[PDB]
Amino acid sequence: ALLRILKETEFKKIKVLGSGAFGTVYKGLWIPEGEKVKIPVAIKELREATSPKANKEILDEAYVMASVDNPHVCRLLGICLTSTVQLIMQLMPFGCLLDYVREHKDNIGSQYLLNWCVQIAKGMNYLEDRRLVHRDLAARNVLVKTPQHVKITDFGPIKWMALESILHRIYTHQSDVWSYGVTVWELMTFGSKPYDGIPASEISSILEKGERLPQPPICTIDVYMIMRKCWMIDADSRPKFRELIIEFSKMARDPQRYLVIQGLPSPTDSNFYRALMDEEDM
Amino acid sequence: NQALLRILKETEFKKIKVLGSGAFGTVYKGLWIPEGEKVKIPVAIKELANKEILDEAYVMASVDNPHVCRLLGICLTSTVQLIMQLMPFGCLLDYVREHKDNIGSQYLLNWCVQIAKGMNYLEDRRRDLAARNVLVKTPQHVKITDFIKWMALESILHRIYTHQSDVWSYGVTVWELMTFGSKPYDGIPASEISSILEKGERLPQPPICTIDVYMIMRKCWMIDADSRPKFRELIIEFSKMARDPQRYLPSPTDSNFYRALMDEEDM
Numbered sequence A: 001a002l003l004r005i006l007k008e009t010e011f012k013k014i015k016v017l018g019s020g021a022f023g024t025v026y027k028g029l030w031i032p033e034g035e036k037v038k039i040p041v042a043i044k045e046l047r048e049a050t051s052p053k054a055n056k057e058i059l060d061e062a063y064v065m066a067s068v069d070n071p072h073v074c075r076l077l078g079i080c081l082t083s084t085v086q087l088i089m090q091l092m093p094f095g096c097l098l099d100y101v102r103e104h105k106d107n108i109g110s111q112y113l114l115n116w117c118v119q120i121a122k123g124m125n126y127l128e129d130r131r132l133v134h135r136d137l138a139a140r141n142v143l144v145k146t147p148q149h150v151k152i153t154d155f156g157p158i159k160w161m162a163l164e165s166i167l168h169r170i171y172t173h174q175s176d177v178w179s180y181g182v183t184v185w186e187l188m189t190f191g192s193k194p195y196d197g198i199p200a201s202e203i204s205s206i207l208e209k210g211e212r213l214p215q216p217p218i219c220t221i222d223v224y225m226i227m228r229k230c231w232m233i234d235a236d237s238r239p240k241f242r243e244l245i246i247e248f249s250k251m252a253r254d255p256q257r258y259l260v261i262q263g264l265p266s267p268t269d270s271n272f273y274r275a276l277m278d279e280e281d282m
Numbered sequence B: 001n002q003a004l005l006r007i008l009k010e011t012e013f014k015k016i017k018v019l020g021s022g023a024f025g026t027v028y029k030g031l032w033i034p035e036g037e038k039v040k041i042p043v044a045i046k047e048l049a050n051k052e053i054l055d056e057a058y059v060m061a062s063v064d065n066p067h068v069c070r071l072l073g074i075c076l077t078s079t080v081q082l083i084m085q086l087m088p089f090g091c092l093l094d095y096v097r098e099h100k101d102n103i104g105s106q107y108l109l110n111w112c113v114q115i116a117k118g119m120n121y122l123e124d125r126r127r128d129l130a131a132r133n134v135l136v137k138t139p140q141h142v143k144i145t146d147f148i149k150w151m152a153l154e155s156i157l158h159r160i161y162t163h164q165s166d167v168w169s170y171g172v173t174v175w176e177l178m179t180f181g182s183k184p185y186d187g188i189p190a191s192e193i194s195s196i197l198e199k200g201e202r203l204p205q206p207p208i209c210t211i212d213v214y215m216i217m218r219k220c221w222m223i224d225a226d227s228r229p230k231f232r233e234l235i236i237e238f239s240k241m242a243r244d245p246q247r248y249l250p251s252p253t254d255s256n257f258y259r260a261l262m263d264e265e266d267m
């Protein structure tokens, strides 16, 4: 296996970073046995309600999440089986792409937005190839390791779910393509809230009437066409993740043609970033 | 070349704590603050012509080996401040001292293989080496950093430093590891080591070393530099002994856990 079972004595919560999923993300510190070092980690402590065999349920799914090997998706490194289960992984210092794009609503060039879509599409394709449904894809679940390396998190949201998911709980790799389209919309709207004002209980109604999200101001039709095609009522007519990688990489080679913004640090800074924080292959 | 180093501006860094000291500087600690960002990244800071130092600093930023340290940054303001990735375990000298018991045979021999792997790389790229200058990333990954009782005889006599003079320094470093951090020539002070080396039968055999291991140490200390073994030969012989370590002297779940958190560089 690749999952390490931890004890309460070998790690400690020191702060709180946010709530999410069935638990709360707590910045932690890992203390190896017989060592004096403190290693920063991320700790997600679920809710209280479990069951005696729920741990067997969680362990089976935890083993799968500990087996992913892609630079854009991310790996579950450890777990703690207490009254409330605690999950341990590597700490992403920049948080998520949603808040990062919101707080940096200016210094986000065109190249950064298109390359983020390429990397998110690369991670989602890896999940599709491993035949794993995500179901919770969104800008809040795209973590930023370095400003040039994003990673998808929280594997297994009415305004992010496909129509077939809201109507009768149909979750497929094409339903994630819908979630990919909403995630791209949030990035290119600089963190705007989708369907702002329109209550959840009425989203399925407006989708049944042909209302998609508005074209963001910085998106040409070439980018907006891709977003709309991900939101077709026919799931099989939506583009595949392998096709999104190719088209978004095509636009990345000429970013100012496909993104219109008013107003990607040199390898000197990229080598400095990866030597300190991002030593994985890609 | 140019895209391997370019840091400085104290406006981006601060020293915060202490981790021992060194003759050339203090390791301290520190935190790097990227421009326009709110995160604090732990780094190591060595606070000790600028065109001279910068040219040599470029060279230290050009090494690409898992067991050789790259110079990531340097502030040319107060006194040559050096930036690298922070090694939480300190050096291999203190670590072997602090854990001088639960160090199995495989751990000691593989450390010698990795030091020989790093030293060979330095020879491959064409002045020190010691247990104190071997930093520990993880307890499975050691790394050579920073650039009398460790110098070769020709180095002590008249400043002759070659890749074979490092083999002498490699031999003294191996002695320190297998003596669990003992001090070489304990007691003999100031100028005198060169006198005993021209007539001596080398440093004593450590208690845990078989004759096969002590012979390698003896051959590294020959008065003829060209008769000393090559770093490429030390890798092969120490790897041979590592496959049967108890003859000559954790689980992948934990190794993957170490590297996913602290050591994401290739094997």
Ligand SMILES: */C=C\C(=O)Nc1cc(C(=O)Nc2nc3cccc(C)c3n2[C@H]2CCCCN(C(=O)/C=C\*)C2)cs1
Pocket (backbone or CB within 6 Å): A017, A018, A019, A020, A025, A042, A044, A073, A074, A075, A076, A089, A090, A091, A092, A093, A094, A095, A096, A097, A098, A099, A139, A140, A141, A143, A151, A152, A153, A154
């Ligand atoms: C991909 C890794 C994995 O398997 N699981 C997860 C890792 C994280 C994580 O590292 N979150 C994180 N790191 C932070 C550093 C500094 C500040 C903050 C706020 C922060 N966070 C988040 C904690 C909860 C997740 C939501 N957060 C957002 O900002 C919203 C997008 C903050 C999580 S899962």
